[PDB]
């Protein structure tokens, strides 16, 4: 006996890259099975299943495939928000909303940390904020090319503060704050901290 729609997978929220393709999902049941059709900000969005030339493929479970994610200075037509709907002789049913989203990351630091000079056993701070990213880049550091963990507790990392309480003599060297998000690595330019004594 024939049944109206019902959505059995929600699409969720999505963050690619430039450059990626992209899976949106939708499922649903009913009989007579029922078609399949996206929304984004409320408008009907073109499948192949429509036009061979779209760049967007509706899977057989009424999924959409983004073969490309479209999103140049001038026109973006694929991030937004968007709803699959289910429909059959017998009625409709619609899913929650999933938001599309193409990650950013910027080349260039928000601000930069700052050379110290300082004496053993007097604290070192370093202060760094990182790009503005989505998702939001994450920090780390470098000293001469090699990772920086606050694994030890001499030295203190959160927020964008490096703290070092007690400087060493083997303090001195080259730092970076690094930026992090699924995009790729951002270096900061590199900052001398110094040691006297």
Known sequence: EDFPPRIVEHPSDLIV??????????????RPTPTIEWYKGGERVETDKDDPRSHRMLLPSG????????HGR?????????????????????????SLEVAI??????QNPSDVMVAV???AVMECQPPRGHPEPTISW???????????ERITIRGGKLMITYTRKSDAGKYVCVGTNMVGERESEVAELTVLE
Do not use: M, Q, W
């Open 17 to 30: 890259s430039k450059g990626e393709p992209a899976t949106l999902n939708c499922k649903a049941e009913g």
């Open 63 to 70: 999924s959409l495939f983004f073969l490309r994610i479209v």
């Open 74 to 98: 001038k026109s973006r037509p694929d991030e937004g928000v968007y709803v699959c709907v289910a429909r059959n002789y017998l009625g409709e049913a619609v899913s929650h909303d999933a």
């Open 105 to 110: 990351l910027r080349d260039d630091f928000r």
């Open 121 to 123: 056993g007097e604290p």
């Open 142 to 152: 470098k000293k001469d090319g090699s990772p920086l963990d606050d694994k030890d």
